[PDB]
């Protein structure tokens, strides 16, 4: 999967040095030291929100090997690699509690929509493309109720 191919694809709304979510590209742009780093909802695992004082500390966890997601070995959300290092979690803080709560809700909703679409695909995947039913040109035999 991919979040963006060109820097132009990144929305102009990103200009705020804050967490910006792109539902169309299923991407969570995170402000890491003035860097607009995109994180695809597929790489994202689960999130935990904790309002500590005036700052809302939200820890966004990501898929990491070792008893991680419930997904079977057949499909892995990352490429196999013993030498690959992973971003396991990022914790952000903000003075604005309401917006930060809305951002967390929107990340959680985006994940639910992604999982639902992947289940719907799988319920249609192994299903072999069947031929089209040919209607009977006369009065068909029927069983009612």
């Amino acid at each position: 999967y991919e979040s963006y191919v060109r820097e132009s694809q990144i929305p102009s709304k990103v200009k705020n040095l804050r967490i910006s979510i792109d539902p169309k590209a299923q991407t969570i742009i995170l402000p890491i030291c003035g860097r607009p780093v995109p994180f695809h909802i597929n790489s994202f695992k689960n999130g935990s929100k904790n309002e500590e004082g005036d700052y809302m500390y939200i820890r966004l966890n990501f898929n990491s090997p070792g008893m991680g997601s419930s997904v079977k070995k057949t499909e892995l959300p990352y490429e196999d690699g013993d030498d690959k290092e992973f971003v396991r979690s990022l914790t952000f803080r903000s003075t604005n509690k309401e917006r930060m709560s809305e951002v967390f809700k929107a990340i959680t909703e985006l994940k639910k929509t992604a999982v639902k679409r992947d289940q719907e695909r799988k319920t249609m995947e192994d299903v072999v493309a069947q031929a089209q039913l040919v209607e009977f040109k006369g009065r068909p035999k029927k069983l009612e109720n």
């Binding site: 200009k15 705020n16 790489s43 820890r59 070792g66 396991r88 914790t91 903000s94």
Partner: protein
């Protein structure tokens, strides 16, 4: 002497825009006088002799000029337009004899890659491209959290007499997972680079406690005013005032012991709630625990309420005594 100047440039993620200037003596940045920034109005000045290398890359506010200094500091200047690149390249080359490098960043959205400890910054590479970099000066502390897990705490930028107000959401903590038998060597190099000093928090912690309600395993971290339950999927913060009652009840199986907390308001997971937290201990489970308290704070606040050290006694007894001492609730 052609002084080249750029308006609307921001220094190190400053909230206020400033005027950036290139001179034969070095780089200068001054905040624009239109914002009442409780704060020194003094121009930032970087001498020409301190400039090592300069990179150009995409930032939040347009393009970012990242200046590497000989003193292992990174200076970030953001707010440039794409057209400014040709002018900046010619002026930096002419004035400092330094090449302006164009650095393309990974936009794939992958959380896997390779970390690379560069002289002044920690770089995370995704498919041979930098995804993000963290200057060592922004790292406050680093701590091995498991056999393959490295947690870096970042200096929370609040109010310092020498720093411009930052604008946005701030990164506080980064956790990396480094597989292979490798994370200890990675940690040692990073720790030695900036002499990171380990710290200890939480009066007392209890790891791997089995809850029957909510069903799951939780770490219990106790503080002076609050109790934290840390769970793989759910973190809870309970104030000590919200604990109404503590029950310590033996199970009839004569093998497990129940500790039960009544909490008001009841904990929430969505629709139905948890007015009672039910913990399950083995009766043969023994734990030794020293309280993380100074001798002055222990004597003044906790003397006769808590023991300074608990010997190797049953975990549920130590936990019930700690809960009694911190919540001031009677154990039933």
């Amino acid at each position: 002497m052609s002084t080249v100047d750029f308006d609307t440039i921001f220094l190190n993620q400053s909230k206020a825009p400033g005027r950036f200037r290139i001179t034969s003596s070095g780089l200068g940045w001054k905040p624009s006088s239109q914002v009442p920034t409780k704060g020194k109005t003094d121009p930032f000045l970087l001498p020409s002799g301190d400039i090592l290398s300069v990179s150009w890359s995409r930032g939040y506010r347009g393009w970012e000029l990242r200046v590497y200094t000989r003193n292992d500091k990174v200076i970030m200047l953001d707010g440039f337009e794409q057209q400014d690149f040709q002018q900046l390249k010619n002026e930096i080359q002419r004035t400092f004899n330094v090449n302006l490098e164009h650095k393309e960043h990974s936009l794939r959205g992958w959380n896997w890659g390779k970390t690379q400890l560069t002289r002044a910054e920690l770089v995370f590479n995704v498919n041979n491209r930098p995804a993000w970099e963290i200057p060592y000066s922004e790292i406050s502390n680093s701590n091995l959290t498991g056999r393959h897990e490295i947690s870096m705490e970042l200096n929370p930028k609040t109010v310092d007499e020498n720093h411009y107000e930052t604008l946005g959401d701030e990164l506080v903590e980064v956790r990396l997972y480094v597989p292979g038998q490798k994370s200890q060597l990675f940690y040692e190099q990073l720790k030695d680079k900036a002499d990171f000093d380990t710290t200890s928090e939480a009066i007392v912690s209890f790891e791997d406690i089995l809850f029957l309600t909510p069903r799951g395993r939780f770490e219990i971290s106790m503080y002076a005013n609050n109790l934290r339950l840390r769970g793989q999927s759910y973190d809870y913060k309970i104030q000590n005032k919200n604990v109404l009652r503590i029950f310590s009840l033996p199970r009839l199986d004569d093998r497990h012991h129940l500790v039960i907390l009544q909490v008001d308001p009841p904990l929430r997971q969505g629709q139905t709630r948890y007015p009672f937290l039910v913990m399950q201990f083995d009766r043969n489970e023994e734990l030794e625990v020293e309280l993380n308290l100074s001798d002055e704070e222990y004597k003044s606040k906790y003397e006769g309420k808590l023991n300074r050290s608990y010997g190797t006694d049953s975990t549920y007894k130590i936990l019930s005594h700690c809960l009694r001492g911190l919540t001031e609730r009677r154990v039933i």
